[PDB]
Design a protein around this ligand. Structure first.
Ligand SMILES: *OP(=O)(O)OC[C@H]1O[C@@H](n2cnc3c(N)ncnc32)[C@H](O)[C@@H]1O
Ligand SMILES: *OP(=O)(O)OC[C@H]1O[C@@H](n2cnc3c(N)ncnc32)[C@H](O)[C@@H]1O
Ligand SMILES: [Mg+2]
Lengths: 218, 5, 208, 4
């Protein structure tokens, strides 16, 4: 349904780090041209082992540089940068964030969850939190369609779930790319059917991916 | 729950 | 290091959807010595499922990918081959015979028999990776021979046999980079067919 | 049958 098509939705992504940058790129390539990207940190050389950007963006704000990359993917790309932390201090910035339909949290920070729950979004939004486990052995994937973010329930679900190719080893580019692909699919499924959803994915040593709750396959 | 993005 | 791809020279024949993303993944984990063999130009329609952007449209796929790969890390040492496999010059064929791991990402049955007909003049780790037409599956073949086993690879592909989006190809790029790293860590005759589900979960069926 |  066109009214449940993310390609027509404005999509804020709070956190232009490893997972957020790769998700933002995935969404831009499928046609999500109206993206907001919020991050106050600068890119550094140690980030490049697990990021969408290159050395040309080292020293630049992570949001501004990500938005430059995104606006080179498609002719109608209209990505916009917010070089600050959430929540903003300006009232203009807050009003700009309140124009986005889908608010996608990719920070891994519990304080950001608390800030989302406290911000006055002034209308119903499709909230989507996404983060990985410490060695990228799994992916927490929470979603909700409410005027205020449900921080308590999200935290509860996260706590309840809680060579170098092996998932137990530290995270590499391919680990984050795998969970950016699984999270982009989760983001598109949530927008197609909004509601309270929670899923926990797991990378296995044989190269397979599993989900809790189980849905497809044996 | 430790989470890394 | 003998089991470590970061110290191996890695030729990647095919700088398209799957091969561009695999190359980038490998560069970011530390595979700095890479070759990239492709003769076609990057097209605007390729970008929906590719590692590069509009700034590379109109440029040879190999050269553009190598320019991108050399900007990823300081020690990146990617090299471009703007010709189709096999080369025509005898210098070029010697250049390809310096690479340890030859990774075919073309999906072309002609390249498979070209690999078998090429004289590598040494043992190599050959890896062929391709997807089904709607990226519902991934064919993942590997071998460690002095000549590419084209008959057997074709057999295992035939036995296993909406439009693919960026999240479909990126998932398989990740799976394939993990397959590539498992093969170089334990070389041998390996074949595995993966299948993606609507929620991004992956199932596997290896050949015995 | 195969697409890279
Ligand atoms: O690299 P990584 O997995 O740590 O990614 C986390 C990213 O999230 C950003 N972050 C952290 N806190 C915030 C707030 N409050 N607003 C926006 N982005 C935020 C980190 O800077 C990092 O890029
Ligand atoms: O887009 P796609 O999935 O078809 O990607 C295939 C890539 O493989 C390249 N290709 C095809 N045939 C050859 C040969 N013989 N040598 C090098 N590269 C080759 C396509 O150009 C595309 O990039
Ligand atoms: Mg830093």
């Amino acid at each position: 349904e066109a009214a449940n098509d993310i390609r027509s939705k404005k999509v804020l992504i709070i956190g232009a780090g490893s997972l957020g940058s790769m998700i933002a790129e995935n969404l831009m390539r499928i046609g999500v041209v109206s993206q907001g990207i919020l991050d106050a940190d600068l890119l550094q050389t140690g980030n490049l082992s697990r990021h969408a950007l290159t050395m040309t963006s080292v020293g630049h704000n992570k949001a501004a540089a990500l938005v430059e990359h995104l606006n080179r993917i498609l002719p109608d790309a209209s990505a916009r940068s917010f070089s600050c932390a959430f929540p903003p201090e300006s009232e203009v910035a807050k009003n700009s964030l309140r124009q986005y339909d889908v608010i996608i949290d990719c920070t891994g920070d519990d304080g950001v969850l608390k800030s989302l729950a406290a911000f006055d979004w002034k209308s119903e939004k499709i909230f989507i939190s996404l983060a990985m486990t410490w060695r990228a052995e799994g992916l927490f994937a929470f979603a909700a369609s409410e005027t205020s973010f449900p921080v308590t329930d999200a935290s509860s679900r996260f706590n309840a779930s809680a060579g170098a190719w092996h998932p137990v080893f530290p995270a590499r580019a391919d680990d984050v790319q795998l969970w950016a692909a699984v999270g982009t699919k989760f983001i598109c499924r949530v927008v197609s059917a909004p509601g309270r959803i929670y899923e926990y994915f797991k990378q296995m040593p044989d190269g397979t991916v599993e989900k809790e709750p189980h849905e497809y396959g044996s | 729950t430790g989470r890394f993005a």
